[PDB]
Design a protein around this nucleic acid. Structure first.
Length: 400
RNA sequence: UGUGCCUUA
């Protein structure tokens, strides 16, 4: 940093004024230095004369190249965000030009910035602080090709998409919904550590839940359709997503949320029914099977219960059935525990048994009797395992 | 006995 600003022992002077720095032409040097940038940070949080503001506007966010340089800088990016805030607060004659220029700078370099660890932070705060019409233009600058995928699955850039989803009306980012819905994109993005969070965030935004009551009816309609398009695509690839190490959380999210009930039933019918035994044996899909049991509508839950109890032919030699296999399987045991607990909740009053214009209590009692009889019969083998001991305990707790 | 992400000096 500038020698004129240092003391005898090579350290930044203590009585340095913001104006000295602004007048010196050496701001860029301070802004990329930790000590210098922090001094600037504190200095710009206080009172500022009009000229001080004017200079900061020109030197921090007035020229494209210096703007990118600081936005991509580990320290500088904070000063950029602070100066943008001040610019937005300053309604002088230059307000409109400064804001348009900031739109242009970011837009023209949108992809480059999104992917940069530090510039993406500048993007995200700009999206929620800038006038909405200008923030909307930033969204428009997002790429529509393979770069969008990279953005969705980047550990830093994914948060730009999530911010867009949070603070920008849907119409501006509808293209992302459809982009992600493409069979090949859906596969990649959902099967990615970060991308699956992005898809979930999208689904949540598209959900007609309590958080969306402020939407106009026209906007709800826009949302309903976008949700329906994305769900169609998720449903077509339900099997692949359910068994995937990352996308299974998405299927779980849809199956678990009452506000997505219609989609819950689709998914269960499309990839779960008739596959319950095999999926209960999958590391990742076993968690989806549990969610389905927990949240299926009663009529469908009866089919699921019937599939486990009666749906499969016992082994030709040993007589082992689906229930034997699942009870002792490293992943299947959790599903059977889930079925048991559902039944105990139902007959214990902890779970509503009325639905579809009828009291299914009789059904839960039947299922429970089956499980109890199985566990009674196999108590010795079962008690060798934590899972078996848990079920035995669950049943004993029910008696009393 | 069984999975993730939620990111800056």
């Amino acid at each position: 940093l500038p020698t004129w600003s240092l003391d005898s022992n090579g350290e930044m002077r203590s009585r340095l004024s913001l104006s000295e720095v602004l007048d010196s032409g050496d701001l860029m040097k301070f802004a990329v230095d930790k000590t210098g940038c922090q001094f600037l940070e504190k200095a710009v949080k206080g009172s500022l004369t009009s000229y001080q503001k004017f200079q900061l506007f020109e030197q921090v966010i007035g020229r494209k190249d210096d703007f990118l340089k600081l936005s991509t800088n580990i320290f500088g990016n904070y000063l950029v965000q602070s100066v943008i805030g001040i610019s937005l607060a300053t309604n002088d004659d230059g307000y409109t030009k400064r804001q348009e220029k900031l739109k242009n700078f970011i837009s023209s370099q949108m992809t480059d910035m999104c992917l940069d660890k530090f510039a993406c932070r500048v993007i995200q705060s700009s999206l929620q602080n800038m006038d909405l019409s200008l923030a909307c233009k930033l969204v428009q600058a997002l790429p529509r090709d393979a770069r969008l995928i990279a953005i969705c699955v980047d550990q830093n850039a994914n948060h730009v998409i999530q911010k867009v989803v949070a603070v920008i009306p849907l119409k501006n980012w509808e293209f992302i919904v459809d982009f992600v819905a493409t069979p090949e994109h859906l596969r990649q993005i959902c099967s990615d550590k970060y991308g699956c969070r992005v898809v979930q965030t999208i689904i949540e935004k598209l959900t007609a839940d309590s958080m969306n009551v402020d939407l106009t009816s026209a906007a709800q309609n826009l949302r309903e359709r976008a949700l329906q398009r994305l769900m169609t695509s998720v449903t077509n690839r339900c099997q692949e997503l359910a068994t995937n190490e990352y996308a299974n959380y998405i299927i779980q999210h849809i199956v678990s949320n009452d506000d997505l009930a219609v989609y819950r039933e689709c998914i269960i019918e499309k990839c779960l029914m008739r596959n319950l035994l095999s999926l209960s044996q999958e590391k990742f899909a076993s968690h989806v099977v549990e969610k389905a049991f927990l949240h299926a509508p009663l009529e469908l839950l009866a089919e699921m219960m019937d599939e486990i109890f009666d749906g499969y032919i016992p082994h030709p030699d040993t007589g082992k059935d689906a229930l034997d296999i699942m009870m002792f399987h490293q992943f299947g045991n959790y599903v059977v525990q889930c079925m048991l607990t559902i039944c105990c909740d139902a007959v214990s009053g902890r779970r509503q048994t009325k639905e579809g214009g009828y009291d299914h209590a009789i059904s839960f009692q039947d299922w429970l009797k089956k499980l109890h009889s199985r566990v009674t019969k196999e108590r010795h083998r079962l008690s060798r395992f934590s899972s078996g001991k848990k079920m035995i305990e669950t049943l004993a707790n029910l008696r009393s």
